């Protein structure tokens, strides 16, 4: 079993000093997955946005600390349910190899609580994708039940054969807010990808 | 407190097929053709993209086991090149999405094996199994299982509803999808089962 390198895999960059403070800019190492043009180039707290947030001691929005380190990565979509999807994408240096079992794990979080008169009750749905090139090899579309204020680990698996059409193509990861309901923000952390010969 | 949700022709046992490895090229009764990219024509032949039922019986040349359930499977074959789109089966149910309920959808997915006079069934196009409410995909297994040539494996899709779910009261649905991500570009499904349990 080999670990595949991912940049900023736990969204620990940038460092954030104040509990529950957050950025509204794409996390370093990641790009914004934006197929429905829901996230603008220039963001504020009020627009659809994504960024990192410090889930530290006494957090108002979770029953636990971050799955890993200080920070999580979050996506918030302001448009009404059904408007489309958005999230994070990262293309990796590793390529798809034959006769290899891939296992992608990501913790997914459901915010709880209240932020100045606003309820974070509800959850938009998530999808975790493993890519080769532009092809989604495997994905977990919203199978886990995630309680308010908790994180749960999503596992995505793909097994390549000797003749896979996508061999030699770059691996990628997408972490997607499905905007299927409100509150329509969610969190991700602790992205891990392993490869093991079959 | 688990309850079975009824599904029409859930094991593709209609129509009856007499001869092992025979198959139909029309949508199976109880089902519709999921066709978001118009890959499957309304009038099919043995030469076109198609779907139907197939008898996976004793002495089958395409599998190392029999059908997961009964005699028959449901198949979807796409003639277009990888990347052209997806297609499959859809069935909208009478049942509706209820609050505080755990839904579990199980479907067996098969990978055909073998050859026939120059035709090769080596390879697999990828699968997705979807649980719907209305037009929304609540949960799906996009191709997570490894399925060996000539075998079936069970896919499990789960969704848990809350008390204020946006889609409460909408009709449940199932889609079984050929992803057309590689060739051979056919695959089989069988033994569709959906249960609901209060949380
Ligand atoms: Ca982290
Ligand atoms: Ca929430
Ligand atoms: Ca059957
Ligand atoms: Ca095959």
Residue by residue, what is the 3-state secondary structure of A111-174? Answer: CCCEECCEECCCCCCEEEEEEECCEEEEEEECCCCCCCCEEEEEEEEEECCCCCCCCCCEEEEE
Which candidate from B123, B138, B165 shows the least CB-CB separation from A142?
B138
Expressed in angstroms and rounded, the spacing between residue B152 Cα and the centre of ligand 4 is: 11
A140:B137 CB<8 A: no
Resolution (in Å) of the shown entry? Answer: 1.6
Kindly report each contact of residues A79-83 with a partner whose C-beta sits within 8 Å and lies 24 or more positions away, as own/partner.
A79/A38, A79/A48, A79/A179, A81/A124, A81/A179, A81/A180, A81/A181, A81/A182, A81/A184, A81/B166, A82/A179, A82/A180, A82/B136, A83/A36, A83/A38, A83/A179
Nearest to A43 by CA among A32, A54, A35, A53: A32
- Could you tell me the two tokens for B98? 């209820």
- Do the annotations mark residue A71 as ligand-binding? yes
State the burial class of residue A17 (Cβ atoms within 10 Å of its Cβ: 0-12, 13-18, 19+): exposed
Q: Rounded distance, CA B47 to CA B79, Å?
A: 8
**B126 Cβ neighbours under 8 A, 6+ residues apart:** A137, B142, B143, B178, B179, B180, B181, B182
Q: Rounded distance, CA A133 to CA A64, Å?
A: 36
- Could you tell me the two tokens for A139? 């994905």
Q: What are the start-end ranges of the E strands in B113-151?
A: 115-116, 119-120, 127-133, 136-142
Q: Rounded distance, CA B117 to CA A193, Å?
A: 42
Q: Rounded distance, CA A5 to CA B48, Å?
A: 43
B159:A140 CB<8 A: no
What phi-psi label fits residue A78: left (phi over 0), alpha (psi between -120 and 50 degrees) or beta? alpha
- Do the annotations mark residue A25 as ligand-binding? no
Which candidate from B142, B143, B165 shows the least CB-CB separation from A181?
B165
Nearest to A43 by CA among A9, A8, A78, A82: A78
Over its C-alpha atoms, chain A yields an Rg (Å, rounded) of: 17
Q: What are the chain B neighbours of A159 within 8 Å (beta carbons)?
A: 146
What technique determined this structure?
X-ray
Q: Rounded distance, CA A121 to CA A102, Å?
A: 34
Q: Rounded distance, CA B122 to CA B149, Å?
A: 7
For B127, name the nearest residue in chain A, comparing CA atoms only.
Answer: A138
Q: What are the chain B neighbours of A166 within 8 Å (beta carbons)?
A: 181-182
């Amino acid at each position: 079993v080999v670990s595949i390198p991912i940049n900023n895999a736990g969204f620990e960059d940038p460092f954030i000093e104040v509990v529950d403070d957050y950025t509204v800019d794409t996390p370093p190492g990641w790009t914004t997955y934006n197929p429905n043009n829901l996230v603008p180039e220039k963001r504020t707290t009020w627009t659809s946005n994504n960024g990192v947030g410090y889930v530290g001691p006494g957090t108002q929005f979770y029953n636990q600390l971050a799955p890993e380190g200080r920070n999580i990565g979050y996506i918030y979509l302001a448009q009404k349910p059904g408007s489309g999807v958005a999230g994070f994408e990262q293309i990796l240096d590793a390529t798809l190899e034959p006769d290899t079992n891939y296992t992608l794990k990501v913790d997914v979080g459901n915010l709880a609580g209240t932020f100045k008169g606003l309820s974070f009750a509800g959850f938009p749905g998530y999808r975790v994708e493993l890519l080769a090139g532009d092809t989604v090899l495997a994905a977990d579309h919203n199978n886990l039940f995630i309680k308010e204020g908790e994180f749960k680990t999503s596992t995505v698996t793909y097994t390549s054969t000797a003749k896979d059409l996508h061999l030699g193509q770059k691996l990628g990861i997408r972490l997607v807010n499905l905007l299927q309901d409100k509150f329509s923000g969610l969190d991700f952390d602790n992205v891990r990808l392993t490869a093991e010969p079959t």
